[PDB]
Amino acid sequence: AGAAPAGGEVRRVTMYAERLAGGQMGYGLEKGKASIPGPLIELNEGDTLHVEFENTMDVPVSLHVHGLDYEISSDGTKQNKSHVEPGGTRTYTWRTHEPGRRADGTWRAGSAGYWHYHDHVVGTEHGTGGARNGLYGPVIVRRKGDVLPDATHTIVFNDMTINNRPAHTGPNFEATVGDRVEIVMITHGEYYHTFHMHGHRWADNRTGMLTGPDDPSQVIDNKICGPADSFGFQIIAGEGVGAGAWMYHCHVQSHSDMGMVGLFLVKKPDGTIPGYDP
Amino acid sequence: AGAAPAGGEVRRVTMYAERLAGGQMGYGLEKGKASIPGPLIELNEGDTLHVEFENTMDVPVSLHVHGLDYEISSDGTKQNKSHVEPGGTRTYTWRTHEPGRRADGTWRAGSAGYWHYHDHVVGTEHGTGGARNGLYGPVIVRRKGDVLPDATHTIVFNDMTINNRPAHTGPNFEATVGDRVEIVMITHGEYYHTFHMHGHRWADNRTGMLTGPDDPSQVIDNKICGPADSFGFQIIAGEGVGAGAWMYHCHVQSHSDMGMVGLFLVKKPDGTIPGYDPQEHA
Amino acid sequence: GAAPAGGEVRRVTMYAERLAGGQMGYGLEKGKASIPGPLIELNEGDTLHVEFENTMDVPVSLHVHGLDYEISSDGTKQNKSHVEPGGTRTYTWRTHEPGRRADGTWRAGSAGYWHYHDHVVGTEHGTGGARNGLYGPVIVRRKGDVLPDATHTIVFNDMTINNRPAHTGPNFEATVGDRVEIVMITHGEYYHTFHMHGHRWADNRTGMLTGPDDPSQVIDNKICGPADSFGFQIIAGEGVGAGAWMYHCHVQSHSDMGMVGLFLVKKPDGTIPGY
Ligand SMILES: [Cu+2]
Ligand SMILES: [Cu+2]
Ligand SMILES: [Cu+2]
Ligand SMILES: [Cu+2]
Ligand SMILES: [Cu+2]
Ligand SMILES: [Cu+2]
Ligand SMILES: [Cu+2]
Ligand SMILES: [Cu+2]
Ligand SMILES: [Cu+2]
Ligand SMILES: [Cu+2]
Ligand SMILES: [Cu+2]
Ligand SMILES: [Cu+2]
């Protein structure tokens, strides 16, 4: 496929927090276009992102990010006066760095990985109301040379829902056999979960794939996660197994039974999915 | 003793789902011989396994496997009509592959690992009643060169039970100091747990053993696990610690207090276990 | 600095003592018990004989994770190595280096972030003892391991941090650029997720990537359950600057009900802007 380049660009983007239907709340890149989860932010190690944020809502909101470099004034917490009053604006700055050798011979780990942002002030000073309402989104930081996927799908286990959706309503994702598909998997709220995919597996490391025959990372199809965990992987759709409606679900038994299930709909080249009948 | 050879053979096994005493259900390789946990299935990477499956019960049942390759017709779900009606039969096919490089340059991970199979249709569309009743078992897929154990033991944290056994009834496993002992650990149901072993430790990687001095995997004696998690390891029994009645238990405090505990009985060569009074462990 | 090779036989006295408010703790001298207990540090190959005294009116024990101990140092009533009220016992912990065995396999060393705790107070798995505060960290270093400028232990004990009242920390101070080591232990009934604002670490033995070839995930959030232990080292404020950097359990209601603390990273002049 493609390969991520070396980073180092200074980037800008506008972001809004807005109310959505039925007490929900979401982030968006354009007014009236908020979504749960929020827009995918992608950066290359070295990039700087200035987020020109605006709160269109009637209550304070903030933007807090995992993993990336930010100064304390972009913490997005009320305690550090980094929240945004109703109608207010503020520029959050996120920075990223390459790995490299420190002066003392140690190895500084880079920014790359599967990360996320979310509100930190709605409902409580820890964003408990903001997370419930839908104020979360994925951030991917790529290392130079990372393979780029054909498509990227974000799955958020938010309490007992997926992406704040009604029970038993997916979401479903479509691919064709051989597609390189990237899953970003984020958890929020109160519960632990176990994320599981039928017919596909991945390595429990940074990229979700073994670096080669010297990489001892476990290969899994079932992963325990809890509030604010994030991980990701790339799989080849239908590799070794073929086309079909491949279930993904939380494997906590009452959780799948109550509707934390969706489908990885993998099609043959002719567009068919053998045996699928919803 | 020994090492795993290269896979590539086409293997076949018969499997039966059967009701067992106490309202339980289990899988077995021979009729009337079901067990909880189900029979240990071991394959070498590259092997194919045809499972000739018969449901001897009055309710639909299925066979769903983690980790291994299978086409959608062997998914073992009602939704894809790969369940088995009462009294019915079906052949499930599991395949496995060796690691290698893709044309796009990336590494395709092999199937090797500590995996497991279980029912997917008893009680609910996700097998909630089936796993609770005992329809679960272990699958080990070995990579060429993997070290082989002197014995393999399977420990399943199924809800608040170990292997569906009553509280404070084990199971216990015996070995002799120096034995290479393999543990397969699987979790099912509703609850997270933490598996702990006294006197022994393992690496948090595929085999549970470090490859050599360049493996940075954390070495642990306590591992959080949730429903359908599976991992495994090998330990040298008593290595650097000696014989004795070595406890394993869930380390969630109320869980150990309520009976999620067992004993790794490591014997001296003369068959004796120092300091082991069984009634003091009751 | 860097860790030397181990191999020394050490001795130390340890006491179990009642503390205020129904609590209990370990200490190295009488009247100096603390929660969490004293940090025990060893180099792979060291032996530690713990000369243990129970100054309490109820039986107590000492049980350790990860280190090599014979069955007589199990610290369990079940194997009769608990300590009656007023009694004394010597517990012996050993450690070893990694190396190749005869069969050709690689024997894992003792090095890592581990912990000790009681096994007999309240129940025969020490449920009361952990709750009351009988726990503490153990670090076993491999030769050449980087040494930190300071070490702080964070224990998530049920819904508390280090048995502290809700929302009262503990707070830890550092200066921008300090090499700070965290030992993170969990006890009790609940799973948690440990999170630090402004910093990240590697999910491996040392919390540091060995170099460009280590594929471990870099994380700032980690799920942990009872008796899990892990540790890491971070450069305080590296790339982010001074500030009152929050750490907390990320299970939402847990941070709301008290599992929050501050990593107070100062400028070289000792000030924290905006705090
Ligand atoms: Cu769940
Ligand atoms: Cu499955
Ligand atoms: Cu967060
Ligand atoms: Cu499933
Ligand atoms: Cu448990
Ligand atoms: Cu222990
Ligand atoms: Cu499953
Ligand atoms: Cu124990
Ligand atoms: Cu918590
Ligand atoms: Cu954060
Ligand atoms: Cu936070
Ligand atoms: Cu313990």
Residue numbers in the entry:
A (entry chain B): 40 to 317
B (entry chain A): 40 to 321
C (entry chain C): 41 to 315
Paper lines:
Laccases (benzenediol:oxygen oxidoreductases) are copper-containing enzymes that catalyze the oxidation of diverse compounds by molecular oxygen. The active center of laccases contains four copper ions: A blue (Cu1) mononuclear copper center (T1) and a trinuclear copper cluster (T2/T3); the latter consists of the mononuclear T2 copper ion (Cu2) and two T3 copper ions (Cu3α and Cu3β). Three-domain (3D) laccases are monomers consisting of three cupredoxin-type domains. two-domain (2D) laccases consist of two domains and exist as homotrimer, with the T2/T3 located at the interface of domain 2 and domain 1 of neighboring molecules, and T1 located near the surface of domain 2.
To assess the accessibility of TNC, we constructed and purified mutant variants of SgfSL by replacing the amino acids, His165 or Ile170, to either Phe or Ala. When replacing isoleucine by alanine at position 170, the T3α tunnel was expanded to 1.16 ± 0.11 Å, the H165A mutation expanded the T3β tunnel even more, to 1.36 ± 0.14Å, taking into account the estimated maximum coordinate error calculated by SFCHECK, which is sufficient for penetration of dioxygen. Replacing Ile170 to alanine and phenylalanine result in a strong decrease in catalytic activity by an order of magnitude. The expansion of the proposed T3α tunnel upon replacing isoleucine to alanine did not increase enzymatic activity. We assumed that Ile170 is rather indirectly involved in the coordination of Cu3α ion within the TNC. Indeed, the detailed comparative analysis of the structures of the wild type SgfSL and its two mutant forms showed that Ile170 can affect (via hydrophobic interactions) the position and mobility of the His157, belonging to the 1st coordination sphere of the Cu3α. In case of Ile170Ala substitution, Ala is unable to establish nonpolar interactions through its side chain and hence it does not interact with His157, which may cause excessive mobility of imidazole ring of His157. In case of the Ile170Phe replacement, the imidazole ring of His157 can be more strongly fixed than it is required for the enzyme functioning. Both replacements of Ile170, inhibit the reduction of oxygen to water, within the TNC and catalytic activity of SgfSL is decreased.
